[PDB]
């Protein structure tokens, strides 16, 4: 009563009442694909096959790099190129998972590379040099991989990824950037700024210095038109240690709606009238990191204003509610919280928030 | 940053202008408010980034920045309006205020 | 809206005061508190400031270390307190509010101040 | 921190 042939190459049997049943994934991947009868009474669960699994064969050739144990810049330029094709909620998973263990390779050559003896002519200055051009090489390659990653037309496997991995799996996107962002502001030489964007990804990573008189940090410059975060020259002092601050400001296009409305703390008003009222991020993703902290709720001497623009701007959207998404690193499940941010002003192209914290 | 306010004494005739400067030591955007003290009483906010006056102040004041040299015109001297004048950097800690006009008829 | 300031008199050199500024019809937990001086035949002075989230403390060198400001939102008043008091420090002491919330517009612009505190040293 | 406008969309 329950058997039936899908597009993808994935046959089933009847199961008589709702048991459960797999076959491959399609020729071209390596994943199965699940799918029995919702109710037992013998009816095909509308959801239809999870293509959460399947991913293209590049997953193994990387695999094998990363046990190789090449320096990581190679294997993640390696990354980019594959991630141009198709993809995969497996090809995602993978890069995800594979962005997390290349820095902790790197994290392995940065503590290799240390002065272990007398610099006789060059030798730390070497060291050093080579760090920060390898370092660099990574992120600018992160940016790529994410540009790729968030295609626009590549809507298809985030869809196919459940609501729960799709969240946590871009949860993890945002966690494995800004650590390479803390690595590469890390590695700076001199108190320099690096910034490597793209048409999706915009990346900011600056390492500056709290002496005498400083100015405010506003990212995008003028790049976006719009969707620009700024902190203030006071906030910089009060996270400043030791005449050094580690500054990552990045801007996120086509990535909100992967992030779920879980728990979403919208206050709403009169203005709810509807019986099937529905929650949007009609906003794209800005983000600002500073000192090394992920999620510690850091306060602010100042406010940071974010005039993030409108995705779609007409008079369907009734009222707006800045929020912040708040994860735990051991689970990289989140959930939207207007916890300390307040709407300042609204219109129909932008809207300014007020946050205290960063 | 260090400002300074001249001319510091004037006597500006009821209705005829004012035009008190704040050299900029440093290039500060904007950033500089004008306070007026009236003797014996607390300061009050006129012109909140050498740009647009407080809601509440009279509309004679108008606020202008000439990119370092930032400046306060009153357009008429309404008889109510002899007091002592600041120009205060509201960009940055240090809070740094400047020597003090003062329009006195 | 009110910030009445109370504690002055005479205090000998090197001695110690603590100001008081009761706010009344604001909250001082989301509201900016700067204590701004003005001595005999002089100009208005910045001592000290705190963010009201952050608890963020920041005085003009003239005051660094020998002055501690604190903002107990708890009974809604700020107090200065003023160790080692030097006789450079006789003025009025004058505690202003600034809205934190709306800080990049009006920004540091001192709306409402007080009567004041004189302090004297002999 | 990750920052965005949570808004509705009446149907
Ligand atoms: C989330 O959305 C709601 C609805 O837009 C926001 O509530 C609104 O907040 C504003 C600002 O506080 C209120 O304006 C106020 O109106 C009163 C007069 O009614 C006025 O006295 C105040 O000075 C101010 O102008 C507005 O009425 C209020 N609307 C409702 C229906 O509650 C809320 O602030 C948003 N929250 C976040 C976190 O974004
Ligand atoms: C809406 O506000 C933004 C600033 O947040 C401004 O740039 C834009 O011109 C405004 N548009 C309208 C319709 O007033």
């Known amino acids: 009563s329950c058997e039936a042939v899908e597009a993808r190459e994935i046959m089933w049997f009847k199961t008589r009442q709702g048991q459960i049943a797999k076959q491959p994934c399609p020729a071209g991947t390596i994943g199965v694909s699940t799918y029995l009868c919702l109710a037992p009474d013998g009816i095909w669960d509308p959801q239809g096959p999870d293509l959460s699994n399947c991913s293209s064969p590049w997953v193994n050739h990387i695999t094998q790099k990363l046990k190789s144990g090449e320096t990581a810049a190679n294997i993640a330029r390696e990354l980019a190129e594959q991630t141009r094709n198709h993809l995969n909620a497996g090809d995602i998973t993978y890069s995800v998972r594979a962005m997390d263990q290349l820095v902790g390779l790197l994290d392995v050559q940065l503590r290799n590379l240390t002065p272990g003896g007398k610099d006789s002519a060059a030798r730390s200055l070497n060291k050093l040099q080579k760090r920060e051009r390898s370092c660099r090489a990574y992120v600018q390659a992160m940016v790529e991989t994410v540009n790729n990653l968030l295609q626009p037309q590549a809507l298809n496997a985030w869809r196919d990824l459940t609501t729960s991995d799709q969240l946590r799996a871009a949860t993890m996107l945002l966690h494995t950037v800004e650590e390479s962002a803390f690595v590469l502001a890390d590695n700076l030489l001199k108190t320099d700024i690096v910034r490597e964007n793209t048409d999706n990804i915009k990346l900011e990573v600056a390492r500056l210095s709290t002496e005498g008189n400083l100015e405010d940090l506003k990212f995008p410059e003028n790049m976006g038109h719009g969707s620009t975060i700024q902190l203030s020259a006071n906030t910089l002092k009060q996270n400043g240690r030791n005449g050094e601050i580690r500054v990552a400001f990045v801007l996120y296009n086509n990535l909100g709606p992967y992030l779920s409305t879980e728990n979403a703390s919208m206050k709403l008003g009169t203005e709810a009238l509807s019986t099937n009222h529905s929650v949007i991020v009609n906003s794209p993703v800005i983000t600002a990191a500073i000192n090394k902290e992920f999620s510690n709720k850091v306060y602010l001497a100042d406010p940071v204003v974010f005039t993030v623009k409108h995705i779609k701007q007409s008079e369907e959207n009734f009222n707006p509610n800045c929020s912040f998404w708040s994860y735990s690193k051991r689970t990289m499940t989140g959930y939207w919280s207007t916890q300390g941010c307040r709407l300042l002003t609204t219109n129909k192209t932008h809207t300014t928030c007020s946050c205290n914290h960063l | 940053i260090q400002m300074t306010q001249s001319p510091s004494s004037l006597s500006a005739s009821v209705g005829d202008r004012v035009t008190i400067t704040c050299r900029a030591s440093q290039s500060v955007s904007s950033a500089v408010a004008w306070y007026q003290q009236k003797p014996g009483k607390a300061p009050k906010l006129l012109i909140y980034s050498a740009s647009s006056l407080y809601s509440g102040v009279p509309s004679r004041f108008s606020g202008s920045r000439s990119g370092t040299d930032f400046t306060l015109t009153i357009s008429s001297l309404q008889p109510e309006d002899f007091a002592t004048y600041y120009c205060q950097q509201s960009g940055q800690y240090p809070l740094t205020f400047g020597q003090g006009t003062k329009v006195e008829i | ?122 | 921190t990750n920052f965005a406008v949570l808004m509705a969309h009446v149907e």
């Not at chain 3, 110690?16 to 900016?32: E, H, P, Q, V």
């Not at chain 3, 701004?36 to 009201?52: D, F, M, N, T, Y």
């Not at chain 3, 270390?65 to 107990?72: L, P």
């Not at chain 3, 420090?89 to 007080?114: I, M, P």
């Open chain 3, 1 to 122: 809206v009110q910030l009445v300031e109370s504690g002055g008199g005479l205090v000998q050199p090197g001695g110690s005061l603590r100001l008081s500024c009761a706010a009344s019809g604001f909250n001082i937990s989301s509201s900016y508190i700067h204590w701004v001086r003005q001595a005999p035949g002089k100009g208005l002075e910045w001592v000290a400031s705190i963010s009201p989230y952050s608890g963020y403390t920041s005085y003009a060198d003239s005051v660094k270390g020998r002055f501690t400001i604190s903002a107990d939102t708890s009974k809604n008043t700020a107090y200065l307190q003023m160790n080692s008091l030097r006789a450079e420090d006789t003025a009025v002491y004058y505690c202003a509010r600034h809205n934190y919330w709306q800080w990049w517009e009006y920004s540091y612009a001192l709306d409402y101040w007080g009567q004041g505190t004189l302090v004297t040293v002999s």
